[PDB]
UniProtKB/Swiss-Prot annotation:
This is CREB-binding protein. The gene is CREBBP. Residues 3-110 form the Bromo domain. It is found in: Cytoplasm; Nucleus. Methylation of the KIX domain by CARM1 blocks association with CREB. This results in the blockade of CREB signaling, and in activation of apoptotic response. It comes from Homo sapiens (Human).
């Protein structure tokens, strides 16, 4: 179907806020990765399509998504980037896995209610 921006925002924002409420696990993901500020200069050699919570939130707030799977795609892109770049034993990788667990619990009833 065709989705109105306000409809997508009201339905999907709670799933995004569930990620933000994870503390400390959302902290690596709330703003875009700046490899200079973080001291990880090889980041963009590995992560070619960056994504983060602030970008997703702004896109959802300002109507940049036409349909809900575009939002889901961006969330998983953020997770996949972090699992690709960070080592399996690293703190940031483990934090990512926690966010993905939360997202999987929240997203399916919302997607079913949408469409
Ligand atoms: C270099 C190691 O950091 C990273 C490496 C890789 C990635 C990714 C997303 O692949 C992200 C980080 C990372 C981590 C944290 N915090 C913690 O790990 C933490 C908090 C408490 C305990 O541990 C904050 C920020 C951060 C940002 C993005 O914007 N601001 C502002 C920030 O502070 C970035």
């Amino acid at each position: 179907k065709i989705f109105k921006p306000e409809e997508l925002r009201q339905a999907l924002m709670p799933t995004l806020e569930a990620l933000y409420r994870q503390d400390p696990e959302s902290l690596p993901f709330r703003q875009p990765v700046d490899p200079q500020l973080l001291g990880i200069p090889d980041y963009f050699d590995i992560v070619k399509n960056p994504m983060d919570l602030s970008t997703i939130k702004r896109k959802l707030d300002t109507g940049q998504y036409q349909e809900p799977w575009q939002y889901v795609d961006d969330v998983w892109l953020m997770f996949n980037n972090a699992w690709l770049y960070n080592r399996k034993t690293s703190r940031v990788y483990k934090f990512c896995s926690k966010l993905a667990e939360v997202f999987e619990q929240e997203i399916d009833p919302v997607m079913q209610s949408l469409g």
